[PDB]
Amino acid sequence: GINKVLDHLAPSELIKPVKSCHNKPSVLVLDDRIVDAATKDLYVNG
Amino acid sequence: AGRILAMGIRFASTGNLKIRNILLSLVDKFLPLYQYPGKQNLDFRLTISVINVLTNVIVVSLSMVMCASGDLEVLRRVKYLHEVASGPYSDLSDPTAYLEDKKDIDDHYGKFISTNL
Amino acid sequence: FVKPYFQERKHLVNVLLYAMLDLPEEELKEKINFNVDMKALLSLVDTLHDSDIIRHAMLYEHILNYYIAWVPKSSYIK
Questions:
Q1: CA distance A23 to chain C (A)
Q2: Alpha-carbon distances of B14 from A45, B3, B56, C68, rounded to whole Å
Q3: What's the DSSP call for residue A24?
Q4: Mind telling me which residue stretches traverse the membrane in this protein (chain A)?
């Protein structure tokens, strides 16, 4: 039990898939000339 | 972190075997997760920053209990924490980029002071 | 300890570079007035020419295997 909760706390081999993150900071588009379902969720006034 | 730090300071320089073995098991378990930005998520990133703090504490505490002995496995663990920067680079708006690099370089500085101690 | 005895002898420099470059005995015999043992020349030549003197998972394994596996007057000594 002690070992298993440590493994749940610290999953060594379970988590790391490939370690291949691109690391660039993601950019959000705020323009209001294109109509899309995702933009409508974040942009309210129409 | 708090429990092991009190534990390490309590058995300071007196040396022991069970405490050393427990910390060896703990550091072996906690070492692979260290400085792994796999899925760049703020919740995950904060938790693994706490992991970096926790692994810094375990190495320092393990060194504290086994001070002045020149042990092998403690040296083995502290050598590994010392070498290999890891992090986002390698393998495992200008001021804004400056702050982004500053956060990572400060993380490396914090990781280095612990292993040097 | 031994070099001053080498500088004492005069013809050492010429014969040794000629040994270095493995020059033929005919060129040696043209301007050197003392006999040189051909067997010694071939033996030193033989000694001179004697020359007996999947990528991200290996980093986790080789970071662990190479950094946690404790293996328990100038240099001029090449």
A1: 16
A2: 69, 18, 21, 25
A3: P
A4: none
